[PDB]
Amino acid sequence: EYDAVWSKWERDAPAGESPGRAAVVQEMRDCLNNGNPVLNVGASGLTTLPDRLPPHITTLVIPDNNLTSLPELPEGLRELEVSGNLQLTSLPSLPQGLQKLWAYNNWLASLPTLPPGLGDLAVSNNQLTSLPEMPPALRELRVSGNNLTSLPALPSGLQKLWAYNNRLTSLPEMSPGLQELDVSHNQLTRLPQSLTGLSSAARVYLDGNPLSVRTLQALRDIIGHSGIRIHFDMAG
Amino acid sequence: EYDAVWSKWERDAPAGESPGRAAVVQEMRDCLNNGNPVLNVGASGLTTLPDRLPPHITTLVIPDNNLTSLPELPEGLRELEVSGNLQLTSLPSLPQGLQKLWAYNNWLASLPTLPPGLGDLAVSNNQLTSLPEMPPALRELRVSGNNLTSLPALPSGLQKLWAYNNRLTSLPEMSPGLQELDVSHNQLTRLPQSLTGLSSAARVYLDGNPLSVRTLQALRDIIGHSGIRIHFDMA
């Protein structure tokens, strides 16, 4: 059942990938035998992955490799980290129970439909020009270093948003309990007046934006009245 | 849309339960404003919960109350904890990304279809007679104090299983990774061969089970193979 899929994967290996693919198969067998819910394939120029992965894993870690696609994901996965795969333009359909998705530094041109219970979404340094609707339970969004123009409406539960180094020409309405917003180096000029909801403890970062004279003066007003920490470029 | 349903429920309180529901409806309002992912209704002895709940929460706690039914759950709920509801007999369809389900010391007769990502399921001390197919990622399972006579196929990653004080006449195949199994005080005459496949480290608990002679022989054969702590006292 599993031996067959993994055998064909190991045999189809180019020289150079033989030790790497062996180490992974050994790890996957270990996972079945002892019940380890975590699978980390390591960095070894992997060009492909097996068709089936152990069914019970909850965490899958894919370090720097040369993948162009990912196989069907474990039906009960809760954490996925993929980084450093520059031929990887898209992701497989995400399992419903996924909680954490770190897909930094690949070449994603889009993102699949996001699982209901997703809490942490970090997809910085990709190729994304837009993003899908956000699930209600989200508490962290990191989408920096992409050519995003706008952002979807944010779930109210959101605690942190990083979207710096994009092409943002506006912001959506803010969640009420936001603690940290970094949108440094975008094309923002008008603040969503929605921002005013941020608490005294909250930290905002607006450096490297044009900002309309009125909006600058309005921010200068907020600091004096709210004691809030807001950073932005200023002449003088 | 939101504060027309929850508003009525606050003043729809049956006489006596008025102060309790106010605290719950305070959290219903308060929770939305400060972002908070958790919600705890407390042991207010509420007869019913609001038709709609905060859309963004991830943890819902429900101590000793007097509920009989439960509303539709938030789409992104991750942890559900319900206990001391001696008249709560069923649960609503569980959210796709539920990870922890603590629904014990109630009066549940049935469980819904389990979310794929469910890792911790504790439903001890209810009224259960069967269980649905187990999520592939399940790790710990507590189903003690019910009326189960059988268990579904166990997933590969299952680590700990407590099923004492049931009517188990039989057991499913063990995943080899299993490390703790308490099936004491059941009606097991014989147990599965999969026991030989378990780690040396695993602790098994069998007391108050009418194990047959041939099984004693098999157990002595298993204990002898690895030194696996398989507890069965003659007394």
Give the 3-state secondary structure of chain B. CCCCHHHHHHHCCCCCCHHHHHHHHHHHHHHHHCCCCEEECCCCCCCCCCCCCCCCCCEEEECCCCCCCCCCCCCCCCEEEEECCCCCCCCCCCCCCCCEEEEECCCCCCCCCCCCCCCEEECCCCCCCCCCCCCCCCCEEECCCCCCCCCCCCCCCCCEEECCCCCCCCCCCCCCCCCEEECCCCCCCCCCHHHHHCCCCCEEECCCCCCCHHHHHHHHHHHHHHCCCEECCCC
How far is the C-alpha of A104 from the C-alpha of A80, rounded, in Å? 11
Residue A197 contacts B, CB cutoff 8 Å: no
Strand partners, A140: A120, A160
Q: Are A52 and A5 in contact (CB under 8 A)?
A: yes
Q: Which of A78, A95, A156 sits opposite B99 (nearest CB)?
A: A78
For residue A230, give the 3-state DSSP assignment: strand
* Pairing relationship of beta strands A229-231 and A203-205 according to DSSP bridges: parallel
Q: What is the DSSP letter of A146?
A: S
Q: Angle at CA B167, nearest 5°, toward B161 and B169? A: 85
Smallest CA–CA distance, residue A105 to chain B, in Å, is 26
Residue B198 contacts A, CB cutoff 8 Å: no
Residues of A in contact with B115 (CB under 8 A): 96-97
Give the total residue count for chain B.
235
CB contact under 8 A, A37 and B157: yes
Taking residue B153's Cβ as centre, other Cβ atoms within 10 Å add up to 9
Smallest CA–CA distance, residue B150 to chain A, in Å, is 22
Smallest CA–CA distance, residue A1 to chain B, in Å, is 15
- Residue B82, judged by CB atoms within 10 A of its CB (0-12, 13-18, 19+), counts as buried
Strand partners, B122: B102, B142
Smallest CA–CA distance, residue B195 to chain A, in Å, is 14
Question: Tokens 């759950």 sit at which residue?
Answer: B73
Question: Tokens 């508003």 sit at which residue?
Answer: B7
Strand partners, A40: A61
Nearest C-alpha neighbor of A124 from the set A96, A94, A101, A98: A101
User: What's the maximum distance between 2 C-alpha atoms anywhere in chain A?
Assistant: 70
Residue B210 contacts A, CB cutoff 8 Å: no
Identity of residue B186: N
Which residues contact residue A88 at a Cβ distance below 8 angstroms, ignoring those fewer than 6 apart?
Answer: A67, A68, A69, A70, A82, A106, A107, A108
Q: Are A87 and A69 in contact (CB under 8 A)?
A: no
Mutate to test the interface with B, among A114, A134, A156, A196 (most CBs of B within 10 A): A156
CB contact under 8 A, B137 and A34: no
Q: Compute φ and ψ for A234, nearest 5 degrees.
A: -140, 140
Structure tokens at B118: 């469910």
A1-236 homologous superfamily? Ribonuclease Inhibitor (3.80.10.10)
Helix axes A18-34, A2-11, angle to 10 degrees: 170
Domain spans of chain A?
A: 1-236
Q: Angle at CA A129, nearest 5°, toward A124 and A131? A: 75
Q: Which of B58, B157, B158 sits opposite A137 (nearest CB)?
A: B58
Residues of B in contact with A139 (CB under 8 A): 37, 58
Q: b/e for B192-216, b at 16 or more Cβ within 10 A? A: eeebebbeeebebbbeebeeeeebe
How far is the C-alpha of B87 from the C-alpha of B107, rounded, in Å? 6
How far is the C-alpha of B54 from the C-alpha of A113, rounded, in Å? 23
Structure tokens at A121: 């979404």
For residue A38, give the 3-state DSSP assignment: strand
Q: Are B102 and B125 in contact (CB under 8 A)?
A: no
Which residues contact residue B16 at a Cβ distance below 8 angstroms, ignoring those fewer than 6 apart?
Answer: none
Q: Angle at CA B57, nearest 5°, toward A120 and B21? A: 170
How far is the C-alpha of A220 from the C-alpha of A215, rounded, in Å? 9
* Pairing relationship of beta strands A100-102 and A120-122 according to DSSP bridges: parallel
Q: Compute φ and ψ for A81, nearest 5 degrees.
A: -115, 115
Long-range contacts of A62-71 (CB under 8 A, 24+ apart): A65/A41
Smallest CA–CA distance, residue B32 to chain A, in Å, is 7
Chains A, B: CB contacts under 8 A, how many?
145
- Residue B221, judged by CB atoms within 10 A of its CB (0-12, 13-18, 19+), counts as exposed
Smallest CA–CA distance, residue B18 to chain A, in Å, is 29
Q: Are B156 and A54 in contact (CB under 8 A)?
A: yes
Structure tokens at B1: 């849309």
Q: What is the DSSP letter of A15?
A: T
Residues of B in contact with A176 (CB under 8 A): 32-35
Resolution (A): 2.8
What Cα–Cα distance (Å) separates residue A166 from each residue in A124, A145, B69, B124?
10, 6, 48, 51
Strand partners, A100: A79, A120
CB contact under 8 A, B178 and A76: no
CA A153 to chain CA centroid, Å, is: 17
Q: Are A98 and A121 in contact (CB under 8 A)?
A: no
How far is the C-alpha of A192 from the C-alpha of B33, rounded, in Å? 18
The highest-level CATH class for domain B1-235 is alpha beta
How far is the C-alpha of A19 from the C-alpha of B181, rounded, in Å? 38
How far is the C-alpha of A166 from the C-alpha of A187, rounded, in Å? 8
Strand-by-strand arrangement of the B140-142 sheet = B38-40, B59-62, B79-83, B100-104, B120-122, B140-142, B160-162, B180-182, B203-205, B230-231
Residue A93 contacts B, CB cutoff 8 Å: no
Residue B147 contacts A, CB cutoff 8 Å: no
Q: Which of A32, A58, A136 sits opposite B75 (nearest CB)?
A: A136
Q: What is the DSSP letter of A122?
A: E
What Cα–Cα distance (Å) separates residue B69 from each residue in A14, A21, B53?
59, 52, 14
* Pairing relationship of beta strands A59-62 and A79-82 according to DSSP bridges: parallel
CB contact under 8 A, B156 and A95: no
CB contact under 8 A, A136 and B97: no
Taking residue B188's Cβ as centre, other Cβ atoms within 10 Å add up to 21
- B 154-183 residues with CB < 8 A to A: 155-159, 175-178
Residue B192 contacts A, CB cutoff 8 Å: no
Residue of A nearest to B176 (CA): A33
Which residues contact residue A3 at a Cβ distance below 8 angstroms, ignoring those fewer than 6 apart?
Answer: none
- B 4-63 residues with CB < 8 A to A: 32-37, 55-58
